[PDB]
Amino acid sequence: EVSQDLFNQFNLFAQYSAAAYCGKNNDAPAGTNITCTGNACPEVEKADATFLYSFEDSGVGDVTGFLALDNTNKLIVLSFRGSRSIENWIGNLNFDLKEINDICSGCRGHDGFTSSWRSVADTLRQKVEDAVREHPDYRVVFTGHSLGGALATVAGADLRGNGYDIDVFSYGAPRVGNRAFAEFLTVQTGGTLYRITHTNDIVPRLPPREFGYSHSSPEYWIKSGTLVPVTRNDIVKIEGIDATGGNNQPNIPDIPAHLWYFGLIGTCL
Amino acid sequence: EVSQDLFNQFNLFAQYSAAAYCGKNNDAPAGTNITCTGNACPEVEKADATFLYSFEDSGVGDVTGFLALDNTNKLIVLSFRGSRSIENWIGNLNFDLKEINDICSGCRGHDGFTSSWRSVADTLRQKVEDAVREHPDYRVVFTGHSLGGALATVAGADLRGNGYDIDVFSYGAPRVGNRAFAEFLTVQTGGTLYRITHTNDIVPRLPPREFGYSHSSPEYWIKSGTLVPVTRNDIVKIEGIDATGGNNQPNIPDIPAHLWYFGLIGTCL
Amino acid sequence: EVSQDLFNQFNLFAQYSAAAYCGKNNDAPAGTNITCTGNACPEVEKADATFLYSFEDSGVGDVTGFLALDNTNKLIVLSFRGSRSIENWIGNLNFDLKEINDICSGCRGHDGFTSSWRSVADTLRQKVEDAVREHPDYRVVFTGHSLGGALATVAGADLRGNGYDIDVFSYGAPRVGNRAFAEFLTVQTGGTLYRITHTNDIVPRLPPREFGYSHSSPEYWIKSGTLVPVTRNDIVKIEGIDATGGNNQPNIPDIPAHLWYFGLIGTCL
Ligand SMILES: CCCCCCCCCCCCCCCCCCCCCCCCC(=O)OC[C@@H](O)COC(=O)CCCCCCCCCCCCCCCCC
Ligand SMILES: *[C@@H]1O[C@H](CO)[C@@H](O)[C@H](O)[C@H]1NC(C)=O
Ligand SMILES: *C(=O)CCCCCCC
Ligand SMILES: *C(=O)CCCCCCC
Ligand SMILES: *C(=O)CCCCCCC
Ligand SMILES: [Ca+2]
Ligand SMILES: [Ca+2]
């Protein structure tokens, strides 16, 4: 179980994450209304939400997404798109571990995700901090699905500690690094990480533990099925590094489960 | 076993379906001859068959294929390409069910397939009906492999009942809708659906039954192996909605089997 | 175990193969240095290795790679990229056997790989032979990973016999033809083929034997794991057409194993 308020946040950032896949949301002019197609983000559309920055083909690995101003919810939202292009998929395959001593000693992260974040960190840090300067009353949130959730998690780990909190909501994110990094992500302050998984989605099981990867705690596991509406009683908070019994179970994984986080995600043209 | 005449039709429309994947057959000038590369479609090439309308990047979901006039066999052939582009694949993942009451009461179809057809239906209907008017002695046939077979099935269901029959030949097609749609596609008058599957091809097993999908009856199951020439004795007709014992069996599915329907399909560059 | 000298060659051509995947190495000015990103090819970077020719989306099937002049090792290296684009993948799926009598009597090869090579053979032969004339004491080596190793193997078989040796180093290459072709690749004069495999990489098990495919002899099998450094003691030479007990065993195959040949290969953006 989670609270109705936390459930509402989970649903809203799932929709911001879904919105990052719509092509028109990666080259939109600054100041325009954020919209999706196919009912992919009705709660985002209802809000007074506009683009501060929209990006595609950025850095290395085709970093894509947008930075949104949400005057209804008083948010600054950095939403990273997950995998769509060949370049995205090739980045995901760069799965050796690379030192990220500039985030934490002993920490190592996925080479592809960390290389992609490093290549855009200066630009996106500046954009976020400009938005905070203009709307210091607002809350900074980073979000994404799948690869986008990995990028949001690395970006939050890197950019926290500069005065403003950064909350991260990830949906179906892969593991992003080793046990040291998983522990760092569990205990870091200056914001909260909400790592959301769905049933037996394969993606949070990748890369496998045998390659030196671990998951941060906690996990918010959606137990309701694919195409089934989610309620607050279908989400289980699971504590512990590499905790079993949520998504990390020794059963058959599933691909369609990756595409259903409150609604369809990754499918907006 | 099937009759030699039906076998000859199955082989011919497999080649029309293969031809839809050749890029040169999606942006060809009207009136030019239909050809493939290699031995992808020798029986189409032997016929006096020309393009009426060759299309790509159309509607939503990258609808691609051609409308052909076959003066040898006296056919008007609408052949849809299956999945090749990223956009095709994004459409395939829009696997929620959407109402299609304008086709049949209570029917629901795959959102991607039905949205794609809807986006091109007016244009393609007009072109088919223009050809029928000029060539009333010619038989109208819709065909395709995989996604293309799904589009041909939806299009046939929609455009039947306007004074001329439409036969549909699909090769390795996924399920396209709910039980009501499967029943409608089983009993609809004004043409026959020939739904052809091969051994343990995975695609006719998708989306899974659990998501609310069913298959129309009957099924023409090819039992001969991959790269094995098909004879009329290798094809078995299987009756019953969601029948088992043909392609819909609880065994390990296969990917190369999806590409061998009389010959290679999906591989023409 | 292999000799330290052969190990050094195996490691170097693995890095030349990895370098062919970097986009910047497929369209670079002649005479400029070959480099990669993030330790994908440090031994190539250390050498005086410069572009003689670079190519992308050549011929049919998106033939991509480069021709290098290596003054440190006295090499002329033709490195073919493996699979990245959709077009590459479609070519891989063209897995029927096609006659290659003009390469060797009785030989049949994978339709995709042989069609791709035929479409670039004249141009690349001219580039290789121009380089030979300019540096007649350098050693001609063709190399590649996965599809790129298949192309290097077919190209070497075709272009040998014209007055200079051609050695081939392939990494995780699929089978490329029938038993006659496998025998020819085992016995052909005018160069040596070093066919390198890793643990239970699936790709050297494709297409399956049952489709009419065989492997040339010998095989150099890397027994160390994925993400594990290779030493010369971890490589075993296995002789015999279609020999078992190296990569060709009846156990479960693995995908990540395909990406680790001395280091990560196929992942350079
Ligand atoms: C091989 C990797 C996966 C396929 C490729 C995906 C990414 C494609 C990128 C562009 C490629 C261009 C086109 C080339 C395609 C090459 C051949 C494609 C073959 C796959 C086609 C898929 C459907 C097409 C297609 O038409 O789309 C089907 C659509 O309705 C979506 O259906 C879904 O719900 C999504 C399914 C995702 C895959 C599910 C996993 C498989 C389930 C079965 C597992 C086996 C369990 C057996 C257990 C037995 C013992 C108990
Ligand atoms: C942008 O959003 C607000 C309402 O939330 C308003 O300016 C207007 O309705 C939207 N713009 C357009 C073009 O609809
Ligand atoms: C995580 O798997 C990144 C890709 C999400 C798949 C949605 C379809 C683009
Ligand atoms: C079904 O959606 C399409 C399968 C793609 C063609 C076969 C693989 C090249
Ligand atoms: C051979 O072409 C298949 C492997 C290509 C590498 C895929 C991405 C690393
Ligand atoms: Ca003709
Ligand atoms: Ca150098």
DSSP for A97-135, please give it: EEE-TTT-TT-EEEHHHHHHHHHHHHHHHHHHHHHHHH-
Checking phi first, is residue C156 left (phi over 0); if not, alpha (psi -120 to 50) or beta?
A: alpha
Of B60, B61, B211, the CB nearest to A227: B211
User: Measuring CA to CA, which residue among C51, C18, C65, C49 is closest to residue C259?
Assistant: C18
User: Measuring CA to CA, which residue among C25, C267, C83 is closest to residue A111?
Assistant: C267
B-chain residue closest to A84, CA distance = B86
DSSP letters spanning chain B? ---HHHHHHHHHHHHHHHHTTSGGGSSPPTTPBP--STTS-HHHHHS-EEEEEEEEEETTTTEEEEEEEETTTTEEEEEE--S-SHHHHHHHT--SEEE-TTTSTT-EEEHHHHHHHHHHHHHHHHHHHHHHHH-TTSEEEEEEETHHHHHHHHHHHHHTTSSS-EEEEEESPPP-B-HHHHHHHHH--SS-EEEEEETTBSGGG-S-GGGT-B--S-EEEE-S-TTPPP-GGGEEEE-STT--SSS--SS--BSGGGGEESEE-S---
User: Measuring CA to CA, which residue among B89, B60, B4, C9 is closest to residue A83?
Assistant: B89
The closest residue, in CA terms, to atom 8 on ligand 3 is: A266
Q: Which atom of ligand 1 is nearest to the CA of B150?
A: 26
Read off φ and ψ for residue B209, nearest 5 degrees.
Answer: -50, -40
The closest residue, in CA terms, to atom 3 on ligand 3 is: A83
Q: Ligand nearest B34 Cα, by number? A: 6
A174 lines ligand 3 (CB under 6 A): no
Task: Say if A255 is an interface residue toward chain B (CB within 8 Å).
Answer: no
**Residue entry with tokens 């990756």:** A258
DSSP letters spanning A39-102? TS-HHHHHS-EEEEEEEEEETTTTEEEEEEEETTTTEEEEEE--S-SHHHHHHHT--SEEE-TT
Please confirm, yes or no, whether A258 is among the known catalytic residues: yes
Question: Residue B257: which residues within 8 A CB-CB, separation 6 or more?
Answer: B198, B199, B200, B201, B202, B226
**Residue entry with tokens 């939109």:** A28
B176-215 in b/e form (b: 16+ CB < 10 A) is bbbbbbbbbbbebeebebbbbbbbbbebbbbbeeebbbbb
The closest residue, in CA terms, to atom 5 on ligand 4 is: B83
Chain B closest-CA separation from residue C269 CA (Å): 19
| CA gyration radius, chain C | 17
Say what angle helices C111-134 and C147-159 make with each other, to 10 degrees.
Answer: 60
- Note whether B96 contacts A226, CB cutoff 8 Å: no
Which stretches of A167-234 are DSSP H helices?
A: 179-187
A-chain residue closest to B61, CA distance = A269
Per the structure, the count of domains in chain C is: 1
* Residue A14, H or E segment: helix A4-19
Of A60, A96, A98, the CB nearest to C269: A60
- Counting every residue written for chain A, the total comes to 269
User: Measuring CA to CA, which residue among B130, B128, B126, B123 is closest to residue B140?
Assistant: B128
Choosing among C60, C89, C94, C210, which should be mutated to test the B contact, i.e. which has the most B CBs within 10 A? C94
Distances (CA, A) of B57 to A145, B17, B26, B119: 27, 17, 9, 12
Of A90, A95, A96, the CB nearest to C269: A90
Chain B environment of A84 (Cβ under 8 Å): 86, 90
Separation of alpha carbons C197 and A58, rounded Å: 35
What's the one-letter identity of residue B106? G
Distances (CA, A) of B229 to B226, C108, C195: 8, 18, 32
Q: How many CB atoms lie within 10 A of CB A72?
A: 11
The residues pairing with A237 across neighbouring beta strands, listed in sequence order, are: A220
What's the one-letter identity of residue A151? L
Judge contact between B20 and B79, C-beta under 8 A.
Answer: yes
What one-character DSSP code corresponds to residue A225?
-
What's the one-letter identity of residue B173? A
The residues pairing with A174 across neighbouring beta strands, listed in sequence order, are: none
For residue C24, the CA-to-ligand 7 centroid distance in Å is 15
- Note whether B212 contacts A227, CB cutoff 8 Å: yes
Report residue A239 as tokens. Answer: 């504590």
Q: What 3-state class would DSSP assign to A207?
A: coil
- Note whether B93 contacts A266, CB cutoff 8 Å: yes
Chain C closest-CA separation from residue A82 CA (Å): 17
CA C32 to chain centre: 23
Chain C environment of B266 (Cβ under 8 Å): 90, 93
Chain A environment of B95 (Cβ under 8 Å): 256, 264
The closest residue, in CA terms, to atom 9 on ligand 2 is: A33
Read off φ and ψ for residue B3, nearest 5 degrees.
Answer: -70, 160
Judge contact between B258 and B172, C-beta under 8 A.
Answer: yes
Separation of alpha carbons C242 and C219, rounded Å: 9
A83 lines ligand 3 (CB under 6 A): yes
DSSP letters spanning C229-255? PP-GGGEEEE-STT--SSS--SS--BS
Separation of alpha carbons C20 and C81, rounded Å: 5
Read off φ and ψ for residue A104, nearest 5 degrees.
Answer: -160, 145
Choosing among A86, A258, A267, which should be mutated to test the B contact, i.e. which has the most B CBs within 10 A? A267
- Counting every residue written for chain B, the total comes to 269
Separation of alpha carbons C6 and A188, rounded Å: 49
C-chain residue closest to A206, CA distance = C256
User: Measuring CA to CA, which residue among A208, A222, A213, A211 is closest to residue A250?
Assistant: A208
End-to-end CA separation in angstroms for chain A: 33
- Counting every residue written for chain C, the total comes to 269
Q: Is the dihedral of CA A167, A173, A176, A178 positive or negative?
A: positive
- Note whether B211 contacts A85, CB cutoff 8 Å: no
Q: What 3-state class would DSSP assign to C261?
A: strand
Q: Which atom of ligand 3 is nearest to the CA of A265?
A: 7
A-chain residue closest to C84, CA distance = A86
A13-25 in b/e form (b: 16+ CB < 10 A) is bbbbbbbbbbbeb
Determine the structural domain holding residue B64 and report its residue range. 1-269
Read off φ and ψ for residue B98, nearest 5 degrees.
Answer: -125, 145
Chain C environment of A253 (Cβ under 8 Å): none
Separation of alpha carbons C22 and C42, rounded Å: 13
Report residue A88 as tokens. Answer: 């995205």
Of A91, A96, A212, the CB nearest to C269: A91
Checking phi first, is residue B158 left (phi over 0); if not, alpha (psi -120 to 50) or beta?
A: alpha
What's the one-letter identity of residue A245? G
Angle at C168 between CA C166 and CA C169, to 5 degrees: 155
Read off φ and ψ for residue B186, nearest 5 degrees.
Answer: -85, -40
Report residue A30 as tokens. Answer: 């600054």
Report residue C120 as tokens. Answer: 């670039």
A255 lines ligand 5 (CB under 6 A): no
Judge contact between B176 and B117, C-beta under 8 A.
Answer: no
Distances (CA, A) of C159 to C61, C156, C165: 20, 5, 9
Chain C closest-CA separation from residue A134 CA (Å): 37
CA dihedral A174, A177, A178, A184 (to 10 degrees): -110
Strand bridging mode B49-58 / B63-70:
antiparallel
Q: Resolution for this model in angstroms, one decimal place?
A: 1.4
For residue B72, the CA-to-ligand 6 centroid distance in Å is 9
